[PDB]
Amino acid sequence: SINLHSAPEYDPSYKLIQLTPELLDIIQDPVQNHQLRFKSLDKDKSEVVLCSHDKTWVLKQRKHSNTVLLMREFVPEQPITFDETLLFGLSKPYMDVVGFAKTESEFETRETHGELNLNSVPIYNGELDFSDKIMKRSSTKVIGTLEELLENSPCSALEGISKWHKIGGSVKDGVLCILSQDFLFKALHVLLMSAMAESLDLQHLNVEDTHHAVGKDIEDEFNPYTREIIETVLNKFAVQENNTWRLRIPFIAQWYGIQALRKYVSGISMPIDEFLIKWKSLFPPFFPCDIDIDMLRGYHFKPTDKTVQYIAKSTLPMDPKERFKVLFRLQSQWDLEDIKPLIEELNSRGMKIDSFIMKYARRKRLGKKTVVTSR
Amino acid sequence: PSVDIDASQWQKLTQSREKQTTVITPLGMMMLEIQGELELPKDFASLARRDSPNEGRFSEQDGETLIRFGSLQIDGERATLFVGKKQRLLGKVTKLDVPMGIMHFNSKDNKVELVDVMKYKVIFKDRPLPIM
């Protein structure tokens, strides 16, 4: 038998974490660069996540009402003999364990979308001589390289690079930055003009040739389209792989449509035809793309059935009833496919979208369209 | 803030040692769950000294006063834990649906170390009886 002993003082550093089958597979992988890392945005407020090299789980502690004692085996330093009490079914002692910890909770892991903590990361608009400006402001926070950013972000490396590329992250003059929408698309426009001006293979672009093509006839001190900018535009509007980029053409057209909405039709509800004409005329010559207004669904609204006007999702409320109120103020009757990407952000329950709409407002159908009226 | 889990040592030991055979891992670990509160003395150094020598119910090991609080006898899946002179607990060895893992937060060096991974637990769900 094994004698069970207890110490007068337990180490509270020992804690129990649930290991799912997938976690076990991850755990038994020596290949990984980083195995697992606990991450948090701050010390006192934000949630704590557990990250592997490519996935993120949020941790939740679950208390229980039982006494849970972990015992480790130990070899007694001096031979110790115990008296026999009226105990039945006792084999000879062969090893000894001691309860060294008393745990009251477990750490459950739930899969969640990793996000970057963009607290101290400033916005770059393509200003000349920006190194001076980073000291015109008092940014104590230092981010030399992107790996340091990822290290201090609640996400994995792959998630980090994907989100960083998605939000158009870059680095200028050794300072990490986030490109403004305007200057990023302007750099895209000039790049496409130069790429089609030099008849480059848009499916097999590399950094050097395009960077050389953009900054050929402008001074380097006043040429903000550096090699890092090139890497960002390629990693944002193209897909890499000896890895080369191929353009995401429908995506580029969609971005371009968002840009057109934000610059030209953000204050008036133009008829769709004239907007499509002007929109079409803004592209660099011979760019291969077709268009339909549904490729900007979720970025616009329709005051009447045949007109379009820009709306930014960021300006919408987070209170459900208020946001629905303002949505119905913009449009009394909505098309379903127009309003669906606009409401995705409010509740993650995974229900039928119609049920999601049915908490405040109500649906009403017709021939093919279903509109929503808050009565 | 952020910190890595160090699991290299446990992993290397796991690959180089055989699969877990009994309820105790090769590194010598066991958990235990009791539906209740284990009522223990609030002090130990003073009380470990008055225990007579024949009983050895409160022993001293390397300057730490350990209490001998019970005995465990494992018969297949069935298990029995004797506590004190007046308690007997009947329980079972159950295979964990979710393999638990014990870790260790070294606050000093801000290092986290994987201690071990469980697969079984010894549970006692019935009211304790006398040792007979």
């Binding site: 949630e47 939740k60 | 284990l38 009522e39 009983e55 004190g84 002179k85 606050s107």
Partner: peptide, 26 residues
């Protein structure tokens, strides 16, 4: 010396899941 026992809980209870802060670990 014989004052060690378990105060039996009539039924098993598992508490509410809680969020974890950095201070919760340390």
């Amino acid at each position: 010396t014989v004052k060690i026992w378990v105060k039996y809980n009539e039924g098993f209870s598992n508490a509410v899941r809680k969020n974890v802060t950095w201070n919760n670990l340390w």
